Symmetry: C2
Subunit: 76 residues, 2 copies
Amino acid sequence: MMNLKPQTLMVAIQCVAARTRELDAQLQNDDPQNAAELEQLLVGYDLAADDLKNAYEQALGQYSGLPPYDRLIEEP
Amino acid sequence: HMMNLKPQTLMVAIQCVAARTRELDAQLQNDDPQNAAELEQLLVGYDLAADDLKNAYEQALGQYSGLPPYDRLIE
């Protein structure tokens, strides 16, 4: 039940967004490797991303000066 | 007592940060010191996040049954 620190939330959000773009790039490759498995992972990454985003929207009211959420998830 | 992140979110985060940390460690052995300072600053941050994640996941291991050991996540 503890909260995560806002700094932790930024690191996690940026990390999962990058991993998500990495797997999307693989899947759009001409002859894809392990597609079923990448799609299963991506379900999980999206759920984690959505949960992080909710926690960050709380942080924005509590810790000053944080970037807008759309900046953290920018490509790049 | 309020973000209420799900255990599974913490698992994905833990794994993601451990992987990004190994990536930056690898890059530091490529023999290009150009941005070594910058990668080392980032690595401090990644380690801080990893510690905070680890704390939170240990709470989860106390509230819920059948979650994987922490060490399995960071292998």
